[PDB]
Design a protein around this nucleic acid. Sequence first.
RNA 1: CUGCCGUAAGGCAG
Length: 155
Amino acid sequence: FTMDHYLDIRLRPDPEFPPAQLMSVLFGKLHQALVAQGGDRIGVSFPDLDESRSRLGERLRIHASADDLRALLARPWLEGLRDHLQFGEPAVVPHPTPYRQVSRVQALDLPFVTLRSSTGQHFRLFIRHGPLQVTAEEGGFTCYGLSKGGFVPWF
RNA sequence: CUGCCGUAAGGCAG
């Protein structure tokens, strides 16, 4: 379990943008930072997830090794959003915790973020937090920080 | 939104 570090990024409430819109922007920006860092050892989870309202919640948690996390934060990927966010301190995770897969699931009672890309076009990216396991099977993460096998601590 | 694997079901990538 070499991914024992995390950081919480919290959305500040905003009069003109609902949470879901900011989160999508946060999440698109992280996507860009992941595509640049390279690798597959950075995951995310949405700790305030609400199953019932199908809402991702107001927090984005980023999971990484102590130094994967540092390389990531020393990038200017949050340039332009920071005013809309509050950040926790990079910390060691609590233990013990369950682990789960947070994956892209391509009627969907699922939360989603809206992104763009070469077309101008908007698309929804659907996200599912998986069943709690006692331990973590090995595996990596996509360029969205979503599971391609890997698991993240849930707390 | 585009695209990949697959004979379509199922699945995947940015």
